[PDB]
Amino acid sequence: PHPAEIVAHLQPEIWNKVNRLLVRKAISEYAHEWLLEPQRLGPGETPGFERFRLTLADGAQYDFDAQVMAMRHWRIPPESIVKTVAGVPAPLDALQFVIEIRDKLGLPVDRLPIYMDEITSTLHGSAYKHGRTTLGAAALARADYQTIETSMIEGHPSFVANNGRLGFDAEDYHGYAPEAATPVRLMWLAVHKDNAHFSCLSDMDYDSLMSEELGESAVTDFAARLREQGLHPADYYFMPAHPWQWFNKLSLAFAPYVAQRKIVCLGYGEEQYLAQQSIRTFFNISRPGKRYVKTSLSILNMGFMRGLSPYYMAGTPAINEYIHDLISADPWLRANGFRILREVASMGFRNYYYEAAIDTDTPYKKMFSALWRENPLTLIAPGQNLMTMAALLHVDPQGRALLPELIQASGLDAGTWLERYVDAYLTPLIHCFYAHDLVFMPHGENVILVIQDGVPVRAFMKDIAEESSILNPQVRLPQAAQRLAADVPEAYKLLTIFVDVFEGYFRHLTQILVETELMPEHDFWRLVAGRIAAYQQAHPQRLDKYRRYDLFAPDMIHSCLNRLQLAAPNLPNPIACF
Amino acid sequence: PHPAEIVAHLQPEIWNKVNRLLVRKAISEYAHEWLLEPQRLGPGETPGFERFRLTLADGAQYDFDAQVMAMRHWRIPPESIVKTVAGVPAPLDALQFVIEIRDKLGLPVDRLPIYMDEITSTLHGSAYKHGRTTLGAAALARADYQTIETSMIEGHPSFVANNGRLGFDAEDYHGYAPEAATPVRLMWLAVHKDNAHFSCLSDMDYDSLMSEELGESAVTDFAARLREQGLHPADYYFMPAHPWQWFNKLSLAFAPYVAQRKIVCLGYGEEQYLAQQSIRTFFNISRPGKRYVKTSLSILNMGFMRGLSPYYMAGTPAINEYIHDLISADPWLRANGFRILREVASMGFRNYYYEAAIDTDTPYKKMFSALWRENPLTLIAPGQNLMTMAALLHVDPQGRALLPELIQASGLDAGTWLERYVDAYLTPLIHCFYAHDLVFMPHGENVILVIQDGVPVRAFMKDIAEESSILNPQVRLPQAAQRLAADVPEAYKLLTIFVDVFEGYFRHLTQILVETELMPEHDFWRLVAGRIAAYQQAHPQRLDKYRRYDLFAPDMIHSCLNRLQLAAPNLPNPIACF
């Protein structure tokens, strides 16, 4: 339609809103990572807080209220932030804020503009989310799996520039952005076996996967269309791709292969999907029980997004199959309910041009891949619902948190609710590490909570082959799942808990718990500590390991996500006192 | 339509054709720049030639016929190129060829893949040009200005990776590529005077420009639409933009300004344009006598394309006005007919975010600009036609050169024709330098020849403000055209002739002249030399300058375009013997 509509969501008032919100996160997170060292001025405008000041570049000054919580966390009320330049009141402008601290960021002056664009696109995305007609916290807490998934707003809670989606143009955004909730249909391509290869669980094959995913009429029509145009279906696999990847990468940079007919565009599938929060993973909304489809997508989001490297193209299902058997044969895990969502099949098209040119790891070897992942809706009972754990940190555009509504709907009290939640989420991770040296990437985006009438019953873990490690070089592994085993320094064994769970997620959850007056910070950590202690007491025989990898150590390693993206002293351990 | 159609032009047979053509250019140009040093084997398959061999990486070997012409030029018959790997015949693959010499290219292993994509996109573009229904050499030589412009194929004759257009997706290409000849209509935006500024010739204004370009009904409707939505037209200029730039850059990276209403999307203009060979300059095909519109476009083509820097936003018309007056007041230039096409007005939107962040020159300060340029059709007589000088090097997909057809249609003989052409093109440049120390960028893309019944009568020069220099620091200049003057080392004064004309263009023209048997190499240079000598004899008083800047010097400076893009011993001067 009218070319102006794709930016219709960019209004002055809403822009100012999301900018104030981002400056708050920028200050809180940068200060958390020692990038900023706020100086205390005096009492806050609200008793619980102190007034702080940042004296910056361009004569810019920011005063704000803050309560420094555990793990050097800066809790800042957004409305308390006041900016002045040389004494003159100024509007909160997150982009301008980044410019004013460009010297502290440490960015090289050629990546700076890129990071600026990541901030801008993050704001662009924020503006859309806050202006879109969406469910409020109360209604959202009671909504279905996919509604909650698409209604998410914050993204990764630590990264300031977390929703760049650089690569999408203004039209791509409205069609492919998860927040737009626009049904997408896959691009289906015939890939030559000279370049393409396939892997799946021991108990399945390509023929049975395609039969379940595409159906027989579709596969038939694909082999017929190849054969009609003079090709041999025998030399081909059928492979799904993100439409954006086809139009922007595969049809262009992969031109030689298209021209030589190693890649043949078969067109759109008939079934529709909804992009998940990972943008390039799709939930089938047209058919019941179908698998997620995860495709390679060459956009820039935080890091530059990938796709199965040659190794993972081949070993992904092997790794998932080993891990699923491990968790299945574990009596404790079986009783807990914790379970992974298997990437059951994967396929990769290999670009021998890029591989001959670059002998090291590169995003250029990961531009054409796909995998299929277990659908969790088939693995739960009637009366249960699924929600991304990211939902626990959700605050609607009116400022209302989802968590209090969720806990209210459960009928439990915050204490009992948070215990149910901790044993469904944290305890199993801690068991996997102690019993199996098995670690994941346990953040809000990767954990799907099984909810039963407001109550957290158990949890699924996804994103397995590329995040999972067995911190034991001696574990006996199938030949294809070998990179699973890792030889890691001692001080990095518990990183997954200290860094990924505690500082990466719990750190943000306690801010919600305090803002909503659900629970005092210290009460939450006593709770967390009691669950770990309870688990340990019930499995006393690994006391040797509990001592060697001390979860109750005074301090812990502090990983600065933002500092790493742009590319610390240990942090007091919140449960060390218990 | 069907997603496969945007690559429909990628067929195996045509792919193989354009690859063989590009390998030929890659070998010829890299060898010319000392990147490759072919070893002679023996006699060619054709008497005029010698057989040469490149022994490369991956065990790859290339044998080819070649006649080394003046200026270390490698004339290679494309069909004579034979590739083998360890003795086994292999198909010509330009991308694979670049990989095999990646070690000699000197590319850093993170720019390599980018250069690979530039090569691939160049081939992608070639495939489309060779497969598209187009006029043959004979019919093309007699065609109108815009048909010739869009029917061009080679691009810059020296750069191997010359048509990358990276940034365009597969759909962008078919809509915006010059070779697609798809009528485009401008995006019109309201730009706030807080950020935007305008410049024009002394004898015009913004109100009169807009009246001629948009009309009164359009301007009125623009001020009305601003005013209707609560804005003040008084704070705004109206500014054209490439639709791609709006959807891919301005609506996204310029989001803060859109959101604050510093930029307001007014929508498409009603008039249609054809993209020129520069991709971002447009010829009005809807209306008679309207100006070219040149917009900023952030794609990668050879170098990363630009747009008026803050300086040129403001000084462009001043520079063109000075230069146009200079050439006008010159009795000799007036008699010759040589004339520039003025960039008569320019406008630039300034991004203070980028300017506060980057204190040096950057493509980030050139993302939103526009200028208007004289239309040459209004400056010629009935019975005359215009053609880009690039047309002289044109060879249609069947292998037929345009030049012989053009010269045939003139009724002149090659000698007389080439003299007419040289005095219309080279002599005026040489006069501008000696009389005025005035230099341009005199390549095929910037020169428009005025043709009268096959005969070259005179020439226009375009691309003025950003290429023109007066090699005399003492020239008295208006305060806005000051960067025009340049303080250049002695050995770099004649670069514009030795490098831009002789090695950059004439070098390729003589290959055409020899292939088509129009004229012997040595006869062309005697011809060129006689025109320069003739001019000098007719203007004897600057003998001091003729001696100081010797055009007949034994050797000359050799600039390696490809080596510079990827980032030599003097070359014998072809006319030094005369």
PDB file of C-alpha atoms in Angstrom, chain A residues 1-4 6-8 10-13 15-16 58 93 95-96 99 102 109-110 112-114 116-117 120-121 124 167-173 187 225 246-249 251-261 265-268 351-354 356-359 362 364, chain B residues 1-4 6-8 10-13 15-16 58 93 95-96 99 102 109-110 112-114 116-117 120-121 124 167-173 187 225 246-249 251-261 265-268 351-354 356-359 362 364:
ATOM      1  CA  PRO A   1       0.000   0.000   0.000  1.00  0.00           C
ATOM      2  CA  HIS A   2       1.169   3.519   0.784  1.00  0.00           C
ATOM      3  CA  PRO A   3       4.950   3.406   1.442  1.00  0.00           C
ATOM      4  CA  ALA A   4       4.505   5.458   4.624  1.00  0.00           C
ATOM      5  CA  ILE A   6       5.500   0.508   7.155  1.00  0.00           C
ATOM      6  CA  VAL A   7       6.680   3.207   9.571  1.00  0.00           C
ATOM      7  CA  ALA A   8       3.193   4.199  10.717  1.00  0.00           C
ATOM      8  CA  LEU A  10       6.852   5.484  14.474  1.00  0.00           C
ATOM      9  CA  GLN A  11       5.038   8.273  16.335  1.00  0.00           C
ATOM     10  CA  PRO A  12       6.663  10.960  18.535  1.00  0.00           C
ATOM     11  CA  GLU A  13       4.872  10.068  21.787  1.00  0.00           C
ATOM     12  CA  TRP A  15       9.000   6.882  20.364  1.00  0.00           C
ATOM     13  CA  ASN A  16       9.710   8.940  23.480  1.00  0.00           C
ATOM     14  CA  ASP A  58      28.706  16.447  25.221  1.00  0.00           C
ATOM     15  CA  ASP A  93      17.112   9.598  23.620  1.00  0.00           C
ATOM     16  CA  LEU A  95      20.596   6.568  20.565  1.00  0.00           C
ATOM     17  CA  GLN A  96      22.021   9.885  21.765  1.00  0.00           C
ATOM     18  CA  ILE A  99      26.760   8.419  21.473  1.00  0.00           C
ATOM     19  CA  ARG A 102      30.814   6.021  22.898  1.00  0.00           C
ATOM     20  CA  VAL A 109      34.807   3.833  15.166  1.00  0.00           C
ATOM     21  CA  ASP A 110      33.647   1.645  12.265  1.00  0.00           C
ATOM     22  CA  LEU A 112      30.043   2.130  16.298  1.00  0.00           C
ATOM     23  CA  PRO A 113      27.563   3.127  13.573  1.00  0.00           C
ATOM     24  CA  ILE A 114      26.522  -0.517  13.270  1.00  0.00           C
ATOM     25  CA  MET A 116      23.969   2.552  16.660  1.00  0.00           C
ATOM     26  CA  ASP A 117      21.793   0.925  13.998  1.00  0.00           C
ATOM     27  CA  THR A 120      17.813   2.146  16.520  1.00  0.00           C
ATOM     28  CA  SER A 121      16.296  -1.051  15.131  1.00  0.00           C
ATOM     29  CA  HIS A 124      11.995   0.682  16.018  1.00  0.00           C
ATOM     30  CA  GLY A 167      18.883  -7.313   7.181  1.00  0.00           C
ATOM     31  CA  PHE A 168      15.108  -7.042   7.188  1.00  0.00           C
ATOM     32  CA  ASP A 169      13.854  -4.028   5.280  1.00  0.00           C
ATOM     33  CA  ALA A 170      10.759  -2.121   6.421  1.00  0.00           C
ATOM     34  CA  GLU A 171       8.565  -4.612   4.557  1.00  0.00           C
ATOM     35  CA  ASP A 172      10.487  -7.696   5.660  1.00  0.00           C
ATOM     36  CA  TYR A 173       9.833  -6.617   9.240  1.00  0.00           C
ATOM     37  CA  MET A 187      10.120 -21.878   0.726  1.00  0.00           C
ATOM     38  CA  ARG A 225       7.993 -31.045 -11.010  1.00  0.00           C
ATOM     39  CA  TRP A 246      15.832 -17.409  -0.501  1.00  0.00           C
ATOM     40  CA  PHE A 247      15.241 -13.895  -1.822  1.00  0.00           C
ATOM     41  CA  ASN A 248      18.214 -12.295  -0.053  1.00  0.00           C
ATOM     42  CA  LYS A 249      20.912 -14.980   0.079  1.00  0.00           C
ATOM     43  CA  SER A 251      19.008 -16.873  -4.963  1.00  0.00           C
ATOM     44  CA  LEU A 252      21.924 -14.419  -5.046  1.00  0.00           C
ATOM     45  CA  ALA A 253      25.116 -15.553  -3.301  1.00  0.00           C
ATOM     46  CA  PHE A 254      24.220 -19.147  -4.172  1.00  0.00           C
ATOM     47  CA  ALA A 255      23.559 -18.184  -7.813  1.00  0.00           C
ATOM     48  CA  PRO A 256      26.165 -20.602  -9.254  1.00  0.00           C
ATOM     49  CA  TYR A 257      24.366 -23.519  -7.592  1.00  0.00           C
ATOM     50  CA  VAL A 258      20.940 -22.301  -8.711  1.00  0.00           C
ATOM     51  CA  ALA A 259      22.237 -21.863 -12.253  1.00  0.00           C
ATOM     52  CA  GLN A 260      23.765 -25.349 -12.225  1.00  0.00           C
ATOM     53  CA  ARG A 261      20.506 -26.717 -10.799  1.00  0.00           C
ATOM     54  CA  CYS A 265      13.095 -23.441  -6.186  1.00  0.00           C
ATOM     55  CA  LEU A 266       9.947 -25.531  -5.775  1.00  0.00           C
ATOM     56  CA  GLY A 267       7.982 -22.649  -4.248  1.00  0.00           C
ATOM     57  CA  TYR A 268       5.924 -22.058  -1.100  1.00  0.00           C
ATOM     58  CA  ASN A 351      28.761 -24.340  -0.319  1.00  0.00           C
ATOM     59  CA  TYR A 352      32.092 -25.717  -1.564  1.00  0.00           C
ATOM     60  CA  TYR A 353      33.014 -22.270  -2.885  1.00  0.00           C
ATOM     61  CA  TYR A 354      32.984 -20.796   0.620  1.00  0.00           C
ATOM     62  CA  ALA A 356      37.441 -23.910  -0.360  1.00  0.00           C
ATOM     63  CA  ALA A 357      37.979 -20.204   0.307  1.00  0.00           C
ATOM     64  CA  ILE A 358      37.732 -20.213   4.109  1.00  0.00           C
ATOM     65  CA  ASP A 359      39.404 -23.012   6.061  1.00  0.00           C
ATOM     66  CA  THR A 362      32.521 -18.773   9.353  1.00  0.00           C
ATOM     67  CA  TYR A 364      29.433 -18.414   5.251  1.00  0.00           C
TER      68      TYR A 364
ATOM     69  CA  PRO B   1       4.542 -14.473  -8.792  1.00  0.00           C
ATOM     70  CA  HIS B   2       6.315 -17.797  -8.377  1.00  0.00           C
ATOM     71  CA  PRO B   3       9.441 -17.225  -6.222  1.00  0.00           C
ATOM     72  CA  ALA B   4      11.573 -19.166  -8.717  1.00  0.00           C
ATOM     73  CA  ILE B   6      13.479 -14.023 -10.067  1.00  0.00           C
ATOM     74  CA  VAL B   7      16.303 -16.456 -10.852  1.00  0.00           C
ATOM     75  CA  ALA B   8      14.741 -17.784 -14.055  1.00  0.00           C
ATOM     76  CA  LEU B  10      20.096 -18.470 -14.140  1.00  0.00           C
ATOM     77  CA  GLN B  11      20.422 -21.359 -16.607  1.00  0.00           C
ATOM     78  CA  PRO B  12      23.410 -23.739 -16.928  1.00  0.00           C
ATOM     79  CA  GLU B  13      24.303 -22.907 -20.546  1.00  0.00           C
ATOM     80  CA  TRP B  15      25.878 -19.342 -16.801  1.00  0.00           C
ATOM     81  CA  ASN B  16      28.784 -21.160 -18.444  1.00  0.00           C
ATOM     82  CA  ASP B  58      44.314 -26.376  -6.122  1.00  0.00           C
ATOM     83  CA  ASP B  93      34.203 -20.967 -13.361  1.00  0.00           C
ATOM     84  CA  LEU B  95      34.202 -17.706  -8.887  1.00  0.00           C
ATOM     85  CA  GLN B  96      36.424 -20.781  -8.601  1.00  0.00           C
ATOM     86  CA  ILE B  99      39.415 -18.802  -5.161  1.00  0.00           C
ATOM     87  CA  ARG B 102      43.008 -15.897  -3.472  1.00  0.00           C
ATOM     88  CA  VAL B 109      40.210 -13.630   4.746  1.00  0.00           C
ATOM     89  CA  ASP B 110      37.120 -11.724   5.916  1.00  0.00           C
ATOM     90  CA  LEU B 112      37.427 -12.428   0.540  1.00  0.00           C
ATOM     91  CA  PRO B 113      33.885 -13.824   0.813  1.00  0.00           C
ATOM     92  CA  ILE B 114      32.523 -10.340   0.137  1.00  0.00           C
ATOM     93  CA  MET B 116      33.421 -13.518  -3.927  1.00  0.00           C
ATOM     94  CA  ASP B 117      29.840 -12.273  -3.609  1.00  0.00           C
ATOM     95  CA  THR B 120      28.913 -13.820  -8.130  1.00  0.00           C
ATOM     96  CA  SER B 121      26.508 -10.883  -8.339  1.00  0.00           C
ATOM     97  CA  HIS B 124      24.273 -13.050 -11.888  1.00  0.00           C
ATOM     98  CA  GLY B 167      22.098  -4.743  -1.131  1.00  0.00           C
ATOM     99  CA  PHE B 168      19.458  -5.439  -3.752  1.00  0.00           C
ATOM    100  CA  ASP B 169      17.582  -8.660  -3.118  1.00  0.00           C
ATOM    101  CA  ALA B 170      16.398 -10.852  -6.001  1.00  0.00           C
ATOM    102  CA  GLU B 171      13.262  -8.714  -6.308  1.00  0.00           C
ATOM    103  CA  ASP B 172      15.043  -5.384  -5.903  1.00  0.00           C
ATOM    104  CA  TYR B 173      17.195  -6.364  -8.874  1.00  0.00           C
ATOM    105  CA  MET B 187       9.740   8.421  -3.278  1.00  0.00           C
ATOM    106  CA  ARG B 225      -0.976  16.736   3.226  1.00  0.00           C
ATOM    107  CA  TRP B 246      13.443   4.577   1.782  1.00  0.00           C
ATOM    108  CA  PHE B 247      12.503   0.962   2.480  1.00  0.00           C
ATOM    109  CA  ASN B 248      16.024  -0.208   3.356  1.00  0.00           C
ATOM    110  CA  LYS B 249      17.723   2.769   5.015  1.00  0.00           C
ATOM    111  CA  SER B 251      12.649   4.199   7.215  1.00  0.00           C
ATOM    112  CA  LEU B 252      14.937   2.090   9.418  1.00  0.00           C
ATOM    113  CA  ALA B 253      18.287   3.658  10.337  1.00  0.00           C
ATOM    114  CA  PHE B 254      16.637   7.084  10.171  1.00  0.00           C
ATOM    115  CA  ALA B 255      13.744   5.884  12.365  1.00  0.00           C
ATOM    116  CA  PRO B 256      14.314   8.513  15.099  1.00  0.00           C
ATOM    117  CA  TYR B 257      13.864  11.282  12.521  1.00  0.00           C
ATOM    118  CA  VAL B 258      10.795   9.632  10.994  1.00  0.00           C
ATOM    119  CA  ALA B 259       9.298   9.181  14.455  1.00  0.00           C
ATOM    120  CA  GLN B 260      10.006  12.815  15.338  1.00  0.00           C
ATOM    121  CA  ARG B 261       8.533  13.870  11.985  1.00  0.00           C
ATOM    122  CA  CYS B 265       6.861   9.990   3.672  1.00  0.00           C
ATOM    123  CA  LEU B 266       4.678  11.727   1.090  1.00  0.00           C
ATOM    124  CA  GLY B 267       4.675   8.715  -1.238  1.00  0.00           C
ATOM    125  CA  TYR B 268       5.474   8.040  -4.899  1.00  0.00           C
ATOM    126  CA  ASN B 351      21.950  12.930  10.332  1.00  0.00           C
ATOM    127  CA  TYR B 352      23.289  14.617  13.478  1.00  0.00           C
ATOM    128  CA  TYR B 353      23.413  11.239  15.226  1.00  0.00           C
ATOM    129  CA  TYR B 354      26.000   9.935  12.762  1.00  0.00           C
ATOM    130  CA  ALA B 356      28.124  13.486  16.423  1.00  0.00           C
ATOM    131  CA  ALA B 357      29.390   9.900  16.490  1.00  0.00           C
ATOM    132  CA  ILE B 358      31.860  10.056  13.594  1.00  0.00           C
ATOM    133  CA  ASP B 359      34.087  13.114  13.230  1.00  0.00           C
ATOM    134  CA  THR B 362      31.979   8.278   6.276  1.00  0.00           C
ATOM    135  CA  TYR B 364      26.975   7.383   7.083  1.00  0.00           C
TER     136      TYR B 364
END
